[PDB]
Ligand binder design. Structure first.
Ligand code: HEM
Length: 411
């Protein structure tokens, strides 16, 4: 029995996400066709011209694909499943220069090096400065009385996290943030004029300039650690560092921002959870917010060989799209998945991907950013109330909130 979906429904259609999350449609697949071929008409494949893809809606399938990276490749078609329909193939393949879109062994080398900058020590050293900034952000927003939660609360701290990790001087953080905000959102009319390719070129240039500067004058931030050769001569070239910085902007900015915005949307919809958060401040909240927000709706892989997955035959060369937004509400894994429960524990969500070679290296940095900012929101604007509905981002793989008017005070 075919799933009850509209003829031609495409789960990567940006026009859906500009309006809503296709929650009921995902649940229909989980029940009636947990692995479902998503057909795509000619020229409507968001940059991919292969007829469609396998929709992966169950968490254990998402995990199986993510563990078997030897079969399911990130390099072959990249992991973003939707661009503008007219994007040139070469602009897809230039994205192979970031570690996210690499397969082993190239990925293994880069991840090993880049792991130097995401040790628990490197991340935890940012705690106090980020905590201060979180408090300052929330204080300034509340003093404005009312405004755009996305811009006055959610946007800044993720960017300051990246700047702090990289040791970006304060004078430069303005243009770093600008470049990072021009990397995604390309398909929304409000951002139709951003040029992601131009922005990345400038970022790489700035990043390479910082790499050579930091070689001359080592410090104790991670840039020095990344570009200094270890015993085996391993280190990031200047351009490899540039592509690393580009990836941090792509992977660590709007995702965390959107977790914060939608975390607060969840709290506004579930005031008992909000009261419980304000009293207890449970850090488990961070994972339930990420599960609820699932900022990355989906990443894809490409089969390098035939592979049978939960009784479905994936063919060599076919794309499989991991719908984290569906898997994070999988009734077979989660107790009451549609209950927002900041105490959920354990919380095996795949908001940071499925466990495997590409698992989000910034997951704990993100969790700390979320906990710090929501502590500050609780400290400075505990009676925050929305004014109007959120505006969603037109994107086929990012679950974004562009704007959200809130009254930071009671009235
Ligand atoms: C809520 C916030 C975030 C979410 C939802 C998120 C989500 C993800 C996902 C789904 C992946 C792919 C995992 C896979 O394919 O198995 C990923 C990878 C990655 N993330 Fe995150 N991320 C977040 C925050 C961050 C931050 C703050 C950073 C760094 C500052 C970061 C850096 C990375 C990097 C470098 C990768 C590539 C790892 C690799 O390819 O080996 N992310 N992230």
């Amino acid at each position: 029995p075919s799933p009850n979906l509209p003829p031609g429904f495409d789960f990567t259609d940006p026009a859906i996400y500009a309006e809503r999350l296709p929650v009921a449609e995902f649940a229909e697949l989980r029940s009636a066709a947990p692995i479902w071929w998503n057909g795509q008409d000619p020229g409507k494949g968001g940059g991919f011209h292969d007829g469609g893809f396998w929709a992966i809606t169950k968490l254990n399938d998402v995990k199986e694909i993510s563990r078997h990276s030897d079969v399911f490749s990130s390099y072959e078609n990249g992991v973003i499943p939707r661009f503008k329909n007219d994007i040139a193939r070469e602009d897809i393949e230039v994205q192979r220069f970031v570690m996210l879109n690499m397969d082993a062994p190239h990925h293994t080398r880069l991840r090993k090096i880049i792991s130097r900058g995401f040790t628990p020590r490197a991340v935890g050293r940012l705690h106090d400065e980020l905590q201060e900034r979180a408090q300052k952000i929330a204080a300034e927003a509340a003093a404005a009385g009312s405004g755009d939660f996305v811009e006055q609360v959610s946007c800044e701290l993720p960017l300051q996290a990246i700047a702090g990790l990289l040791g970006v001087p304060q004078e430069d953080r303005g243009k770093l943030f600008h470049w990072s905000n021009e990397m995604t959102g390309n398909e929304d009319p409000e951002y139709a004029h951003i040029d992601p390719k131009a922005s990345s070129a400038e970022l790489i240039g700035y990043a390479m300039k910082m790499a050579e500067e930091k070689a001359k004058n080592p410090a104790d931030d991670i840039v020095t650690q990344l570009i200094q050769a270890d015993i085996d001569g391993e280190k990031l070239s200047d351009d490899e560092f540039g592509f690393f910085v580009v990836m941090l902007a792509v992977a660590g900015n709007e995702t965390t921002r959107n977790s914060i915005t939608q975390g607060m949307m969840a709290f506004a919809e579930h005031p008992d959870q909000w009261e419980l958060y304000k009293k207890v401040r449970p850090e488990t909240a961070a994972d339930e917010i990420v599960r609820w927000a699932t900022p990355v709706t989906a990443f894809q892989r490409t089969a390098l060989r035939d592979y049978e997955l939960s009784g479905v035959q994936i063919k060599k060369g076919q794309r499989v799209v991991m719908f984290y937004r569906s898997a994070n509400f999988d009734e077979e894994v989660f107790q009451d998945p549609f209950t927002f429960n900041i105490l959920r524990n354990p919380n095996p969500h795949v908001g940071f991907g499925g466990t495997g070679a590409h698992y989000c290296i910034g997951a704990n940095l993100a969790r700390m950013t979320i906990n710090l900012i929501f502590n500050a929101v609780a400290d400075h604007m505990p009676d925050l109330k929305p004014i109007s509905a959120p505006e969603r981002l037109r994107s086929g793989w990012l679950n974004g909130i562009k704007h959200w008017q809130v009254d930071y005070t009671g009235r």
